[PDB]
Amino acid sequence: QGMFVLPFMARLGVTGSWSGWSITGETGIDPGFWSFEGVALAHIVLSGLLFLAACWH
Amino acid sequence: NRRVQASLASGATLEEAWSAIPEKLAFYDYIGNNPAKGGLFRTGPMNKGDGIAQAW
Amino acid sequence: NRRVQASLASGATLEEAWSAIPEKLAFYDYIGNNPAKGGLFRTGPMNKGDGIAQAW
Amino acid sequence: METITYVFIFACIIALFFFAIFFREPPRIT
Amino acid sequence: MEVNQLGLIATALFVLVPSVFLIILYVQTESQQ
């Protein structure tokens, strides 16, 4: 499916989505915060804080 | 082939021996999944080329 | 209608009176060619909407 | 593609807000 | 959704062309002073 960063999240242990599927095919699973969506959100938040840090410096 | 030769040893038919091969393993034995079969400006997912695999 | 009545009064059948109607005239008597049936952001030729007319 | 386009424009407007406020030409007196 | 395929380029050029115009005018104003 042309997924490029999905396997790097999968590689280190992120395997499930907040919508309840996992890439191993297991349905009905609670990944906690550290889902594919949570990792993405974290990088967006982190990107915004570094933006502000850059203006200050 | 190893697994087929084994099943026939244990006395299964050709149909049985081959029906025991997982689809996942056969799908690996297909040149469309060979990473060296593409082109520089053939863009997108592999499903955009030979399509979405449905069944063996 | 004026031509169909005329064809009928001189004794043509319904099929004959109406078959004598040129398609070009019939195509004008159709709201898809009415210029007040469009929309601001419905872009392109009229053919892109109801299609390319083929036959009456 | 249309979702990306809508969100891209909106995000450009928010960044512009940042610059218009914090990087405005400062008003100086007389 | 089955959206008009040229809507993307319409929108991109609609933003890009007048924005670039303004940026050109602003920057050459700043290098004057």
Next chain:
Amino acid sequence: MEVNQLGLIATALFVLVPSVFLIILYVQTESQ
């Protein structure tokens, strides 16, 4: 011809963005 639809935008931006870059730099060089 059944070409790529993103081909148009890729070509258009490929020309537009770097060209605008150079125009910006050239015009502000001239006015100083």
Next chain:
Amino acid sequence: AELTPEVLTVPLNSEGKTITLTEKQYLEGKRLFQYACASCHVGGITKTNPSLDLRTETLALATPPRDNIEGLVDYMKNPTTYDGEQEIAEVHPSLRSADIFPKMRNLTEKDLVAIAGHILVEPKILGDKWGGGKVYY
């Protein structure tokens, strides 16, 4: 057009005798209908049972026919269901139930005739609007 005696002529009974109301009676009937009836029967429908309206053709098919002064005056005294099978004074305003419907207390016999008369005249003026509901507003 005007409120001529022809329009003010309505059946008195099933026998076929008729009666000509006055314009006084009509206006009085309209006013009393508004006072005692309109909250459910505005425009000749029934808000709390829309299947039964006050159209003259509906009144005619009711048991006791109600498309005449007598039937309507009797109805305001001893209302029944459409087939006449049961008395419904306990859930419908009437003189029989004026204790539980206090607005019926001060209605005289003359008042009933006017209310009945208005109900019979009004479809002659409005036609489909009377009892037709919002479709005809």
Next chain:
Amino acid sequence: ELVNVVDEKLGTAYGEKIDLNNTNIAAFIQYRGLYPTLAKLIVKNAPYESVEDVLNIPGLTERQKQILRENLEHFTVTEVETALVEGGDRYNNGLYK
């Protein structure tokens, strides 16, 4: 193959008489003496294989049987149509004025 079964039903006697197996109860108001008492009995005891069946409703007084006979020519039966009898639509089909 895909047919609107209610439209199709309008092409049968359902579209011209009171169908004892399908029509909503408010239609029995069009004939004298039917509503609400007999209409109630009729709807509750549907379906009927023949219009004549309604005269065999247990409990009919002799006058109720007379009203039915008077009106039998305004009745019909057709096959029960699930779309018209589910949801209690024979008692309230969502139509008022």
Next chain:
Amino acid sequence: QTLTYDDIVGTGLANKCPTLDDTARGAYPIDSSQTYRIARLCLQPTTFLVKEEPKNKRQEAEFVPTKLVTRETTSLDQIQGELKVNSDGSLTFVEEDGIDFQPVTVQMAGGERIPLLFTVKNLVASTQPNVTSITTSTDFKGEFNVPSYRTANFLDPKGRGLASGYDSAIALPQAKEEELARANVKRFSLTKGQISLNVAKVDGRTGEIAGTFESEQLSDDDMGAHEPHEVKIQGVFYASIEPA
């Protein structure tokens, strides 16, 4: 201690079926010379399972779990009907009336909403022959009716319906209609479901029983627009029995 409405309201208890005491391991004798009825049957689902489509050849996907999103609105209750005795000592319950349907929508992994009409409408459930006593090993097995999730007046978002509404896609006046037939012609489905009620508790004195149920039925097909799913429902039930 019998609770009042003001004790229940807003607690969610109104959606639960009455429980029986864990001691209630009696047997309720059945006298075939008597007639009986269920004064109240209460069914309370706890689990909604939806069958997946494996898309490949011979795999037959299983039932996966789902999340309920329509809240504490799921229980059938006040159901009543004849409890007959047959010429072989079996009992048959014939459902007569009650709140015997609840619309439910659960959500599968991936976000698909599956709506369904959880129901026991027209339930007919029978025991084994020669029962003579309802015990903590009695099983009822039966089938019921699953009418269309929407009834005939329902109008889709473009105004199309069965007993009402447009008969075509009026926003596409000159589009070819053949591709739209499935969505333009509404259809009222009527399918059967299957249910097992397994009795685990019996108050011999009061005629109350309680236990476990599993039913299988079809989800909503949106008036023939799309194919339904198969749904497994598990829960607890409570019934009260009376001499008729």
Next chain:
Amino acid sequence: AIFRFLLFFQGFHNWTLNPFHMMGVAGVLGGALLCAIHGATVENTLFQDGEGASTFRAFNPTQAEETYSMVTANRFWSQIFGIAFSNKRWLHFFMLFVPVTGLWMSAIGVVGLALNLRSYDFISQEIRAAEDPEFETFYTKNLLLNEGIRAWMAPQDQPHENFVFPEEVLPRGNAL
């Protein structure tokens, strides 16, 4: 009669969906806002030029001095809103610009409507909705309303057309 004109343009032209009207809306509401925020600002940045609790008397139309502090007004709005006017000429020109432009824009959209050149639909929304009877938006909900308006007012609002709509053809939701 003008009210009917409004409702007509909704039911037939779907005029609320027209971006030229939306620019007119933003111009009219933008003006009224500017109007109120400019009057309020001046009245609460006045200089104390007299002694009475009525601040109106402390103004002379021939005085050279500004009667309110632009400097304080600019600080206030800069700290409340982020940006503020700093140039009185621009500010008053902007007050001309906003409602005048807004009105001009709505006039253009009306010119289109002369031809029935409406912004009535979104084609992508309709293609999906026709094929997918579970897809619903506020867009599809508003067209149902338009269809109600048209069918229910047309016979009486266009009497020269002799529209006869029998009860059974009238679009109607459940019960109502």
Next chain:
Amino acid sequence: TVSFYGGELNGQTFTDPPTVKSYARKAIFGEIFEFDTETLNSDGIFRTSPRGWFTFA
């Protein structure tokens, strides 16, 4: 019922209600034509002519 005189369906009569309704939905547009919608991937929605576009501009 619907009967056709002249044109491509000349002398043909239709009696099945869904077919007859289908033509009645087209008859509100005036005369009835056969359209090719595939070639241009036509969406089915009326557009204005050059007379309209010219007048508007």
